[PDB]
């Protein structure tokens, strides 16, 4: 093809993030060269998940997102058959060994209130913790339990607003927002 968004995504995100996002879309029958808005979203969600796991202790989180579907479900079964928690219907993003619960990370271009409403509607397993971030700097989690420290979450939202600025500077933000 030849989109501005694709070149910006490769310039904005770490190369391993781009490769993992490409593998995730190709596993789900998606092309980064055509669905470039989803390409930027999957890269953003990937980085947010990794910065999230970077916060806290060393052995606190088990990273579910970023693995292939078979191995991700294998780790989920291992975590469930070990601690005793219920197997979630859909694949979560992380598992907290400190709080003993799965975490679903969300990144939205609209109000954080609407996304969780759809995220909580889909996620039937109420045990799975939900934590939403927005590109405007807002966040909200289940039971107001934000899991990480304030500084780690502040670093996440700062990065999100930086991605938003870089997108608007090259005039891809408008098409990126009205596409979720």
């Amino acid at each position: 093809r030849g989109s501005h968004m694709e070149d910006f995504v490769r310039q904005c995100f770490n190369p391993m993030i781009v490769e993992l996002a490409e593998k995730a879309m190709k596993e789900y029958g998606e092309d980064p060269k055509i669905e470039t808005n989803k390409f930027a979203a999957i890269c953003t969600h990937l980085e947010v998940c990794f910065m999230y796991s970077d916060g806290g202790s060393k052995h606190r989180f088990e990273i579910i997102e970023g693995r292939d579907r078979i191995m991700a479900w294998t780790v989920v079964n291992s975590i469930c058959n070990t601690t005793g928690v219920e197997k979630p219907k859909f694949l979560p993003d992380l598992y907290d060994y400190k709080e003993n619960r799965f975490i679903e990370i969300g990144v939205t271009r609209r109000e954080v209130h609407i996304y969780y409403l759809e995220k909580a509607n889909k996620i039937k397993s109420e045990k799975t913790h939900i934590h939403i971030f927005s590109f405007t700097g807002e966040e909200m989690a289940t039971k107001a339990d934000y899991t990480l420290d304030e500084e780690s979450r502040a670093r996440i939202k700062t990065r999100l607003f930086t991605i938003r600025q870089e997108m608007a500077s090259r005039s891809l933000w408008d098409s990126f927002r009205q596409s979720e």
Copy 2:
């Protein structure tokens, strides 16, 4: 030869783990290409020991397992002639500088209760701490003192159940369980 277990072991474990396990069996007159079930067990026990030492403080543990028999006993003598603890009859796996005791790590495919019964029967030195893990997610230690934090131990059992799933997915689990 040409066993499925040998190729799975090389694909499942870190290369340095495989090399250390090979050296340990060859030091005891064992061939990984024929005794592939023991090959997978020595790799599993090696990784569990290293994840165990990864938990806790930086200078907490001295790693006895993974060294050659002569150097491992040299470190054991050094630890004994320093702190003043009794020299164990058999080589332990770790030494805890925080609790001032040797640690014997066990990984079992049967009930954790039976192994320790044999492990405690062999280990005459009652000072040596014993900590057993199972592939089903169970654990138990001497005096109910589990040494590490809950998250580090939970990560160990999750990995053990993942190895069990990968083994059963390729139909090596049955021959691996009824072989201990």
Copy 3:
């Protein structure tokens, strides 16, 4: 799934070869975990192509195989619009800057005579050079022009027979041969 061939492929070939083969099959809607015979073939063809380009001078060959379909065709157009050769109907494997022709590399489990007959039947552009290798140690090229030196080609066939031996040692050769 859980196939012996998949674990052998990951143990036999270089990791970057495995990743490039995975991307090539996923680009063509193929799963390495199910089509493990094709997984071993695409890895073998990939390595043969890279050893082939390793023979000769430094700037002799342009590597077409291993790139994504869009970039591979981009390099082919560049080579054609530069030297003046005709654009081949299908994607070749290499381009020889010394002989000024595209090269199609083939690896077969049957007689080398049959494959080229199908390869030359498909390849309408007679300018594209064809070079076939077999797992038994045979080779043959267009116009009896074998391009590389004898030692580089001998190293290629030696590797092919080593892959064949390792496959038969674990009893995957029979299913691999009667699958082409």
Copy 4:
């Protein structure tokens, strides 16, 4: 040219520090080969900023100094539009996620009291924290809040006095002091 200060700067500071300082001066139309005193000052200020961020927690500080003017302001806007603090008139050096304020780092060859008087006079945004260091071993911060621990600040001043000694040993300190 051919100044002793330029060769000392390249020998005294880390290579990446020298490259970042060169880019900062060239961005502001300055030549390190002629303004060698400013070359040593920008390297010193750069290293002090990086040692400052090295103190404290992992996610505590966002490093503003060292980036290009456009990206530095992009991060500042991100931090402001996230936490809600006021946009400073001039570019600060760091942002504290723990104290929720921007930090302006200063390094002086005169009394620390005079510099801050000029630094606080320029910085209209009173929210921005100011922290001055001197080459004699003195320091002072806004509201007597020195942000970091005593050991991290002591390491900073020790390095500053070491740079001063190395400068005087080669007879560049006198021209470096009477040049601020």
Copy 5:
């Protein structure tokens, strides 16, 4: 700013090429973020020079392009005061130790005949060899002496046409051609 050409340049060329081009423009008071067409040209000319020096023997070429103006002239003086050749009026790109002459590399978007006419008009020192490349695949050198082997030059023009295709695929080729 926010140009498509800038993100494509960072995605198309090697990172060290981009950094060297940035330093060359900033040394001459030029901004890559605004003069993005010149940004792509200086990166292209830089890579062509490095591929050119990559052809031939190990100690054949001395690379003049890519150094700062002071050090580049220092190497030119060294070469002149050693071999005895005349000092060129303007900075050349390479020096051939085999042919004992300086080389001026040119990359053009128009006919190679016009550029050399301007290049030979500017270069008063007739000893300096001139070698022009075009994005269409044409080349021509002084006295029809093309210095390198055919394969090394063919690789250069293939890369040039690949850059041209990638530019046209994202619709920057038209503005890049009508800008020389």
Copy 6:
């Protein structure tokens, strides 16, 4: 020459430790090939100092030992002119930023009581803290303030007894002990 001690020292200690010890002896007009007992002692003292600084916080210690005499004294002057402590008569080994004092590390083959008696007799500056270790597992520090945690010191003495065992295993311990 050709001593067993020299080959054991190179096999027992880290290569950078050996190089730093060689530079220290050559700076004081000493040859490692002839004074091999001192070679083993300077390597042992070097490693103990580095393990000592490895204990505690990140910015706690400034490492004086291991630098050249001029730079070591330069750091000592920097520390003194910063904190305000008195300049010691002889070069110490470390500086504690937490306790604000210099540390003199000693390793002995005799009773720890005798060495400190000579160490405290030489060190006139009573502010400098003294910490002695022995190859038998004993330690003692000024004012019974052992600075580090018990685990870090236990790791130091364990290493010392391991060096003693390796020396006696090759029959260099007797000549090493009766040589201090």
Copy 7:
């Protein structure tokens, strides 16, 4: 144990050479700590083989020595079933793709004439080329065909005499010579 030869071997040879020699002896039920003379010989023979393969073209030699017995025989079968040469009775050291023959490398402490007499007596396959080196600087090969260039062989014998000097300098040469 505690031998001077073992520490000298670890100090004299490259670490990977030492590891490969250890694996070769342990595969044949041999201990480097007790049979230290054989330890030095297997390291010497290993290095000579690798320097030998280092001479000549890039794809000239296939390295048989240094692999495990199963994989070494697998490569030998591949070479035989490819070129058509006869399978040797015992494992050779190299294969020459240029001369199409296996090479048996020998290193001796006695006269080169006696070793080959035993080497040629054992090696029934007359096709296998034999090339002997001595620690005194002598060499001789089958049919006076020395395979490599004079400089590569001269470098091999120079290294052999250097190992001999280092051995005699520490008084292990006498026990090493009267032990073959």
Copy 8:
């Protein structure tokens, strides 16, 4: 001390060159901080020797310069007891396996004719080849046999004149020339 020459030497030469030169002077009881002119000369002679060995084939030269006095003489004895050449009275710089002779490399600030006259007067062994270079671009060797190709020698003299220019640019050339 604090000399301009010392900082220029560390900035001009590769770090390993500086370390090897420091070890050579300290082995001969010389201080780089005081004899900075000799410091620059030993670095220059070291680099010239390494560029000289870089010319030619892979196994052509054995590097004598840069080793410690004991190991350098050990290699010289090995070369003599192997090829059969006479042991030189003083340590040479290289050995040519192609021409079968030792090489003495010289770098001078005066006329190349005078140095060799002293070099040939000292070197009694007429077999040792002598090759002198100057900072003005002149060279001359024994029997007019310049050993290497013209391009490799031209690269050496170009580097020498570059070092001369950098020295004069900072006003150390005059004191460096009138000091030989």
